Nucleic acid binder design. Structure first.
Ligand SMILES: [K+]
Ligand SMILES: [K+]
Ligand SMILES: [K+]
Ligand SMILES: [K+]
Ligand SMILES: [K+]
Ligand SMILES: [K+]
Ligand SMILES: [K+]
Ligand SMILES: [K+]
Ligand SMILES: [K+]
Ligand SMILES: [K+]
Ligand SMILES: [K+]
Ligand SMILES: [K+]
Ligand SMILES: [K+]
Ligand SMILES: [K+]
Ligand SMILES: [Mg+2]
Ligand SMILES: [Mg+2]
Ligand SMILES: [Mg+2]
Ligand SMILES: [Mg+2]
Ligand SMILES: [Mg+2]
Ligand SMILES: [Mg+2]
Ligand SMILES: [Mg+2]
Ligand SMILES: [Mg+2]
Ligand SMILES: [Mg+2]
Ligand SMILES: [Mg+2]
Ligand SMILES: [Mg+2]
Ligand SMILES: [Mg+2]
Ligand SMILES: [Mg+2]
Ligand SMILES: [Mg+2]
Ligand SMILES: [Mg+2]
Ligand SMILES: [Mg+2]
Ligand SMILES: [Mg+2]
Ligand SMILES: [Mg+2]
Ligand SMILES: [Mg+2]
Ligand SMILES: [Mg+2]
Ligand SMILES: [Mg+2]
Ligand SMILES: [Mg+2]
Ligand SMILES: [Mg+2]
Ligand SMILES: [Mg+2]
Ligand SMILES: [Mg+2]
Ligand SMILES: [Mg+2]
Ligand SMILES: [Mg+2]
Ligand SMILES: [Mg+2]
Ligand SMILES: [Mg+2]
Ligand SMILES: [Mg+2]
Ligand SMILES: [Mg+2]
Ligand SMILES: [Mg+2]
Ligand SMILES: [Mg+2]
Ligand SMILES: [Mg+2]
Ligand SMILES: [Mg+2]
Ligand SMILES: [Mg+2]
Ligand SMILES: [Mg+2]
Ligand SMILES: [Mg+2]
Ligand SMILES: [Mg+2]
Ligand SMILES: [Mg+2]
Ligand SMILES: [Mg+2]
Ligand SMILES: [Mg+2]
Ligand SMILES: [Mg+2]
Ligand SMILES: [Mg+2]
Ligand SMILES: [Mg+2]
Ligand SMILES: [Mg+2]
Ligand SMILES: [Mg+2]
Ligand SMILES: [Mg+2]
Ligand SMILES: [Mg+2]
Ligand SMILES: [Mg+2]
Ligand SMILES: [Mg+2]
Ligand SMILES: [Mg+2]
Ligand SMILES: [Mg+2]
Ligand SMILES: [Mg+2]
Ligand SMILES: [Mg+2]
Ligand SMILES: [Mg+2]
Ligand SMILES: [Mg+2]
Ligand SMILES: [Mg+2]
Ligand SMILES: [Mg+2]
Ligand SMILES: [Mg+2]
Ligand SMILES: [Mg+2]
Ligand SMILES: [Mg+2]
Ligand SMILES: [Mg+2]
Ligand SMILES: [Mg+2]
Ligand SMILES: [Mg+2]
Ligand SMILES: [Mg+2]
Ligand SMILES: [Mg+2]
Ligand SMILES: [Mg+2]
Ligand SMILES: [Mg+2]
Ligand SMILES: [Mg+2]
Ligand SMILES: [Mg+2]
Ligand SMILES: [Mg+2]
Ligand SMILES: [Mg+2]
Ligand SMILES: [Mg+2]
Ligand SMILES: [Mg+2]
Ligand SMILES: [Mg+2]
Ligand SMILES: [Mg+2]
Ligand SMILES: [Mg+2]
Ligand SMILES: [Mg+2]
Ligand SMILES: [Mg+2]
Ligand SMILES: [Mg+2]
Ligand SMILES: [Mg+2]
Ligand SMILES: [Mg+2]
Ligand SMILES: [Mg+2]
Ligand SMILES: [Mg+2]
Ligand SMILES: [Mg+2]
Ligand SMILES: [Mg+2]
Ligand SMILES: [Mg+2]
Ligand SMILES: [Mg+2]
Ligand SMILES: [Mg+2]
Ligand SMILES: [Mg+2]
Ligand SMILES: [Mg+2]
Ligand SMILES: [Mg+2]
Ligand SMILES: [Mg+2]
Ligand SMILES: [Mg+2]
Lengths: 159, 240
RNA sequence: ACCAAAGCUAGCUCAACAUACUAAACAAAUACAAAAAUACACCAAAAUAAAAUAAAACAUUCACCUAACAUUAAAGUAUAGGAGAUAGAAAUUUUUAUCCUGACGCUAUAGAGAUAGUACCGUAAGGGAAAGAUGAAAGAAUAAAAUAAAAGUAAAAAAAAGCAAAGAUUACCCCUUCUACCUUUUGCAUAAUGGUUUAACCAGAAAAAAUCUAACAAAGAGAACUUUAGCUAGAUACCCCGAAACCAGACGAGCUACCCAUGAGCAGUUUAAAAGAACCAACUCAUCUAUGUGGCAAAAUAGUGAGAAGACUUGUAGGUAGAGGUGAAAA
RNA sequence: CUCGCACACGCUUACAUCAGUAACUAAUAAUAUACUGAUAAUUAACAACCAAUAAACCAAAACAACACUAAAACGUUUAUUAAUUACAUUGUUAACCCAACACAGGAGUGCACCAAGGAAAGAUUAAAAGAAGUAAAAGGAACUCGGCAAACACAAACCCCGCCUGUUUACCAAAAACAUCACCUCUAGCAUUACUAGUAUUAGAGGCAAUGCCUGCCCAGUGACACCAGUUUAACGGCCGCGGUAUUCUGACCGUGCAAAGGUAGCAUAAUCACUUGUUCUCCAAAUAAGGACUUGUAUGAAUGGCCACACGAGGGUUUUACUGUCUCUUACUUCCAAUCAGUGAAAUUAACCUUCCCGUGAAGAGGCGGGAAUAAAAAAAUAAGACGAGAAGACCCUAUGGAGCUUUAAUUAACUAUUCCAAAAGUUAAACAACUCAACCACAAAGGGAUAAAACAUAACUUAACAUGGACUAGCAAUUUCGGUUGGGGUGACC
RNA sequence: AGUAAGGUCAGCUAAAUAAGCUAUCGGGCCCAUACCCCGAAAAUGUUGGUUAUACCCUUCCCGUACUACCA
């Protein structure tokens, strides 16, 4: 979004101008997930895919600031969890193929506690944190019973 | 505020259905077509355009139906006729001289030699004679009748070449269409609709036309008697 | 002698410190037409701010104007500008903690709009006030103290003659002499402008060069600069009210223009007629004249008129919103 | 004397009983539906709230027998389900609502015009002026812009412009303006929200106005189409001079020039620049009026329509008849105002006034200056010459490097819609043709000598529906901004 | 009033290389006239200045043309 000068002359009229990227419809193949996604991609994205020598490499090498897409972050998080968990569901019939796929991306392996928070926004993380910490209140009957037992054992050991 | 179109009925029924006027207002609520509104209240009859439609898929053969009555349809400029056959009834557009107690044959079997052209029969363009007047032209096989439905309008078949028929529309423009499309032989009813005279300004209001605006616009370059060559033939046949 | 006058509190303003920042109240009911316990869902959204202005016009441009992380300097320098108006950095530098926080700020036409966003004016967004005074005790109202001083009246109407007064005079007039006041103009008593009168409130502001006074002086200044008598500090300065407009975002079709729904009216008379025919009411428009002109009425009353089975009147409710809507074009 | 009861919508206790009103509210008093305090009230049968799905059914309301064109609100039955269980919740008053008011205004339906609901005059006198009503001698438009108004009149005819009913500037114009049936031009071969649940006898963008007789000539320019030549005026628009010529007049004719064609039919001193009160006849005692003719109207004229006619008109003009206070010429009598008495009590305005006449003077029209005249002070009721009267910071006119609306052949130029090209993107195909033997071999078919290359292009060529990006072209629509000065007031001419 | 604007053979036009057509004059063709063919003559409104003239400017004269508006 910006302005421009007609005829590229400074003394000319000032004009509002919007430049839009040219969008294309392509379906891409990811080796980690073995699924085809029909994703609106640009010619620059395909060039970056070739530059990284792989669709999975492009997602796993480009950082968040370079990707600028929530789908990309979720796509990375899905594959990052796949590597850390080492899920046998990638190919239940070809264990040899499973080893080959994860061998090439062995440099991107991250621990489990790190691989499930890479594609989350601020709002999504808070909901996830609340869900893990969602605990029903402990009844005061249970608290008081433990308190009474401690006193009884304390009195028992005092005699 | 977005409005809802009155065309919500899903099942075909011969009985008249309720109808709401628009007045030129689109779904937004603004005027898009001027000079429409304030007409007499009307009911809509469900018109079956596809002449060839068997009751069941068990017997796809040609079937023959009977005409019960010919009525007046407020919506279109022609006259519609009630036609019953088997276990269903249909409203179809009546030709020039369709009357009560008449039998109409619907068929699709393309025969080599010919088939005699009757005033009500619907046959594919491949079996009709060269010099036949037709109406309710089906642009594509199974699409349905779209062309030549106004009062007194009849198209004439011209020739059939390499398994393809060429017809002449009422606008004197040649149209190319596959010979397997169904068409109806004859001229549409109410022939003298063009000769009808409106006696007063009020009769226009009854039909539903509002008076034109009073702004005086000077004529531009578009006006004047324009002589233009006939546009080339419109063909719906997809050449592989 | 009436009308009036006087009071000093209510609270407010600007900071500082500071926890770290949508208060108080939530028993029940609150986004059905909010404050109405209770039924098969749809749910949601973003697109650079523009212009009034300055350049004495106005088209490129016009500080602050959403998002800076500060202070002493580099500096109003390099640069960017119809090279005009004006816009304007950085490299590189400087900054010792806590208490000492209160007032050469106002006192009911001031200070917040506030006793209050309440009355009240608007369909709505929105606009938005005036208003308090006794004493220690009024469980001292045959109650008490205080100025009796604004315009306006009363006590007390007026007696030839004149910008209303002055010179005077034994004596108020009588006599003599004097063309109201500001603004605006070559020139105004002008019959040119403004003011009934009273109280309260209401309009000159900036320190580059300079002049005056003083400190120290070839050096001055409590860093950063200026210097061939100069440097540092003080004092001396440049108003108020008013347009038609322009741009952005909201709120309005309960009046009116048109349309979509759903309803309701047209008696008698004349004609084979429910024929945009005819006579004439209800009903709907408003031709002509007279009253009315701060009126009964911010468009009416009286008489008289045109249509009155239609392109007709009419109730309820919904739709189109300003670069537009709508229009049997009257801008 | 007559807008009465009730419901809906709205208002929200203003309603009812009792008491009080010195003061507040009523534009006054009595007094209390309207102001204050206390207490009390509208009871459901009426009204609101008050099932879903599948299937059969082409056949109007108007006393509806049966029909018309504009084709029409208004449902029953069968099947599968539906908590089954006295008493649920809510609206019930009024003299009322919207208009700043207890306003002569605005306000839907049912039934009556009354059996119901209300009070034009606070008390006097009986002046002028003003408003409303009745009557009139003789004359009957002599009034006047006009027969406006009024009338014991309530009729007849001609013309102009529109055909007609209808519509518009709410609040100065209701018309000759707009619309309209008719005619004509133009653009479009078609599907799920307009047009349309349609399909060229259809639907939009316009012009002109029924009917009848007609709508002449012109593509040079502009515009549009074709997007090339070209084609289009019921597209914007246009549709001529000079000189001579039949005794005189007129000019059939002729010479010559320019044009895309040179105004044809018709009508005509008109609603038609000026000349203009053209000329003439009829109407009148008298005609700048009205009708009928003459007619270059050098600026009438043919769908920006010409011309003629029926019907129609709260449009505009003229004539006759009848009526009358319009008028010669005013008068009498009533009501509301008016004047006196009692109650309540506002507005524009106001420098101070102890506020005269005349002539002269003067910022050029003096109650105030100068020279003279007049002159006890006050109240009430009248007439409008002056106070350059009061009202609105003049609408006219000019100025302002002050605004805005409209139009385009002004300057600058996007977005958006549509047309076209290039690029991006996707896809398709690819390894190539003009001898002739003159000699002469060969049974043919051909051959050899006298050419049989290279190359296709270092990729090339073409197609591409729907969406859609960047950069250009054309058009529509539209955005920004201005429109110099001097001038014996501005414009115009001229000047700088 | 102002401004605009033009004059050319007898007539009308185009060029300033003063031409073309017609008219006029003479001759031929025909019975005669006209047509037709052949030959000749003919002009830059006016004054002054434009090296010198002409197309130009100026003066005189005729005639043509537009406009004369807001109150
Ligand atoms: K029809
Ligand atoms: K004045
Ligand atoms: K002045
Ligand atoms: K003043
Ligand atoms: K609405
Ligand atoms: K009123
Ligand atoms: K009320
Ligand atoms: K007259
Ligand atoms: K009218
Ligand atoms: K043309
Ligand atoms: K005449
Ligand atoms: K009329
Ligand atoms: K007077
Ligand atoms: K003058
Ligand atoms: Mg229709
Ligand atoms: Mg039309
Ligand atoms: Mg029109
Ligand atoms: Mg400026
Ligand atoms: Mg200025
Ligand atoms: Mg700005
Ligand atoms: Mg430059
Ligand atoms: Mg205050
Ligand atoms: Mg004060
Ligand atoms: Mg006083
Ligand atoms: Mg004196
Ligand atoms: Mg003087
Ligand atoms: Mg003066
Ligand atoms: Mg001066
Ligand atoms: Mg004065
Ligand atoms: Mg003045
Ligand atoms: Mg004054
Ligand atoms: Mg200084
Ligand atoms: Mg601007
Ligand atoms: Mg705006
Ligand atoms: Mg409405
Ligand atoms: Mg009737
Ligand atoms: Mg009628
Ligand atoms: Mg009236
Ligand atoms: Mg009246
Ligand atoms: Mg009367
Ligand atoms: Mg009538
Ligand atoms: Mg009538
Ligand atoms: Mg809205
Ligand atoms: Mg508009
Ligand atoms: Mg209308
Ligand atoms: Mg107009
Ligand atoms: Mg106008
Ligand atoms: Mg009220
Ligand atoms: Mg009363
Ligand atoms: Mg009482
Ligand atoms: Mg009471
Ligand atoms: Mg009143
Ligand atoms: Mg009374
Ligand atoms: Mg009285
Ligand atoms: Mg009188
Ligand atoms: Mg009388
Ligand atoms: Mg008389
Ligand atoms: Mg007379
Ligand atoms: Mg007279
Ligand atoms: Mg008149
Ligand atoms: Mg009259
Ligand atoms: Mg006339
Ligand atoms: Mg009319
Ligand atoms: Mg006529
Ligand atoms: Mg009418
Ligand atoms: Mg009006
Ligand atoms: Mg009206
Ligand atoms: Mg009127
Ligand atoms: Mg015709
Ligand atoms: Mg006509
Ligand atoms: Mg018309
Ligand atoms: Mg006309
Ligand atoms: Mg024509
Ligand atoms: Mg052409
Ligand atoms: Mg004539
Ligand atoms: Mg005429
Ligand atoms: Mg004239
Ligand atoms: Mg007249
Ligand atoms: Mg007369
Ligand atoms: Mg005449
Ligand atoms: Mg003309
Ligand atoms: Mg035309
Ligand atoms: Mg004309
Ligand atoms: Mg008629
Ligand atoms: Mg008439
Ligand atoms: Mg008479
Ligand atoms: Mg009195
Ligand atoms: Mg006096
Ligand atoms: Mg005088
Ligand atoms: Mg004197
Ligand atoms: Mg004097
Ligand atoms: Mg009086
Ligand atoms: Mg008086
Ligand atoms: Mg005076
Ligand atoms: Mg006067
Ligand atoms: Mg005055
Ligand atoms: Mg002024
Ligand atoms: Mg003006
Ligand atoms: Mg100036
Ligand atoms: Mg300006
Ligand atoms: Mg401006
Ligand atoms: Mg504007
Ligand atoms: Mg231009
Ligand atoms: Mg682009
Ligand atoms: Mg701008
Ligand atoms: Mg000018
Ligand atoms: Mg000037
Ligand atoms: Mg002048
Ligand atoms: Mg000029």
């Amino acid at each position: 979004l910006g302005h421009r000068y007609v005829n590229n002359d400074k003394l000319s009229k000032r004009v509002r101008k919007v430049w839009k990227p040219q969008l294309f419809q392509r379906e891409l193949y990811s080796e980690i997930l073995d699924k085809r996604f029909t994703v609106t991609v640009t010619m620059r994205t395909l060039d970056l895919i070739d530059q990284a020598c792989g669709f999975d490499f492009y997602i796993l090498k480009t950082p968040k600031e370079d990707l600028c897409s929530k789908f990309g972050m979720d796509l990375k998080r899905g594959m990052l969890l796949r590597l850390a968990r080492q899920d046998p569901q990638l190919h239940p019939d070809d264990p040899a193929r499973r080893a080959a796929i994860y061998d090439r991306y062995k440099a991107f392996v991250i621990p489990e506690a790190e691989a499930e928070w890479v594609g989350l926004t601020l709002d999504e993380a808070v909901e996830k944190q609340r869900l893990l910490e969602e605990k029903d209140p402990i009844p005061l009957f249970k608290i008081f019973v433990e308190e009474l037992l401690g006193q009884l054992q304390q009195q028992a050991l005092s005699e | 505020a977005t409005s809802v179109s009155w065309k919500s009925r899903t099942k075909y029924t011969v009985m008249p259905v309720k109808m709401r006027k628009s007045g030129g207002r689109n779904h937004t609520g603004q005027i898009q077509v001027h000079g429409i509104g304030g007409g007499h209240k009307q009911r809509y009859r469900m018109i079956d355009f596809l002449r060839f439609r068997p009751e069941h898929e068990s017997k796809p053969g040609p079937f023959e139906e009977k005409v019960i009555a010919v009525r007046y349809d407020p919506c279109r400029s022609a006259d519609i006729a009630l036609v019953a056959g088997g276990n269903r009834k249909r409203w179809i557009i009546a030709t020039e001289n369709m009357k009560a107690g008449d039998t109409v044959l619907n068929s699709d079997h393309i025969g080599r030699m010919a088939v005699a052209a009757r005033e009500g029969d619907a046959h594919p363009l491949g079996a009709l004679p060269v010099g036949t007047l037709i109406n309710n032209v089906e642009s594509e096989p199974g699409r349905g009748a779209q062309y030549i439905r106004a009062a007194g309008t009849c198209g004439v078949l011209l020739r059939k070449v390499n398994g393809t028929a060429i017809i002449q529309l009422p606008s004197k423009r040649q149209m190319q269409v596959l010979e397997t499309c169904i068409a109806t032989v004859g001229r549409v009813s109410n022939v003298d609709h063009n000769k009808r005279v409106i006696g007063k300004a009020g009769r226009n209001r009854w039909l539903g036309k509002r008076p034109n605006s009073g702004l005086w616009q000077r004529k531009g370059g578009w006006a004047g008697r324009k002589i233009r060559p006939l546009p080339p033939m419109k063909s719906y046949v997809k050449l592989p």
